[PDB]
Amino acid sequence: QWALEDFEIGRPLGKGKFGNVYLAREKQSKFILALKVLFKAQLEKAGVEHQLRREVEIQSHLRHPNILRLYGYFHDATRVYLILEYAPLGTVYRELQKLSKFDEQRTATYITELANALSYCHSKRVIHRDIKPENLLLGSAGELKIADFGWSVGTLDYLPPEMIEGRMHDKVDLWSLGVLCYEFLVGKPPFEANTYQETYKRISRVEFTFPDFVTEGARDLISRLLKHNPSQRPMLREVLEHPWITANSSK
Numbered sequence: 001q002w003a004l005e006d007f008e009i010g011r012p013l014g015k016g017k018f019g020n021v022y023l024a025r026e027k028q029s030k031f032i033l034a035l036k037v038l039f040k041a042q043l044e045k046a047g048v049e050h051q052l053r054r055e056v057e058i059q060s061h062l063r064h065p066n067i068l069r070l071y072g073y074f075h076d077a078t079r080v081y082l083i084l085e086y087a088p089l090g091t092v093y094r095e096l097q098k099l100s101k102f103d104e105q106r107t108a109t110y111i112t113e114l115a116n117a118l119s120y121c122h123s124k125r126v127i128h129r130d131i132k133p134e135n136l137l138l139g140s141a142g143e144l145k146i147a148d149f150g151w152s153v154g155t156l157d158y159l160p161p162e163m164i165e166g167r168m169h170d171k172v173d174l175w176s177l178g179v180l181c182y183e184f185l186v187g188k189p190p191f192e193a194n195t196y197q198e199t200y201k202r203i204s205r206v207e208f209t210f211p212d213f214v215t216e217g218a219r220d221l222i223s224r225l226l227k228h229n230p231s232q233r234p235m236l237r238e239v240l241e242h243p244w245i246t247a248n249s250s251k
């Protein structure tokens with residue numbers, strides 16, 4: 001449908017191995033969006049093309065306030081272009097370095113927004129797996145928007161024991177939500193190591209601890225989420241229904 005000459009590219013927004021995302025405006029519509037620029041070269045090279053066209057599938061057909069819209073795509077010679085919704089307030093990653101830590105009411109809200117987001121996804125039998133702050137965008141309202149659906153069906157920090165030990169995986173996303181929740185509160189993930197190999201162990205053995213300032217209800221919720229056994233992990237409903245969530249989730 002589209003072409004590059006339909007757009008006026010703007011300030012660069014992001015980097016990464018495959019290329020960059022830029023601000024851009026659609027010529028005749030004046031519409032503002034984001035253009036992901038991926039090199040055909042590197043997509044083939046790094047044997048991923050299949051992943052790319054799966055991201056295209058899933059993230060297109062999806063619709064939800066807490067999921068980055070994907071309006072479509074197009075390619076040329078050197079590259080493929082993903083026409084993405086644009087998110088004014090950037091990544092959660094950035095707001096985390098900037099603040100280093102989050103409060104309970106910000107954390108809780110994010111957790112909700114995230115829960116609901118994944119509710120909709122699970123309902124459509126799609127799982128993310130790559131839910132890390134580098135992947136969470138903020139809308140104008142300051143609201144969470146899950147981007148990026150490459151790995152939707154490397155940094156182990158976000159990956160649950162089953163995935164990591166290479167097993168039957170169905171609940172993963174709830175482990176991550178646990179992880180995410182801990183990261184928001186403490187300022188780094190609960191499984192952070194210095195090496196790939198150590199992290200693996202730390203995760204495999206579910207070794208994590210709570211700095212003093214982490215309130216009891218938070219621990220509870222996180223603890224419940226970070227169970228080694230997939231089956232023992234709450235359902236999103238319970239997470240939404242948790243007393244520390246509801247107590248705190250401004251939204």
Ligand SMILES: c1ccc2[nH]c(-c3cc[nH]n3)nc2c1
Pocket residue numbers: 013014021034084085086087088089090091137
């Ligand atoms: C900083 C500030 C705003 C941003 N929006 C985006 C973005 C990426 C895809 N859609 N919107 N990245 C940003 C980085």
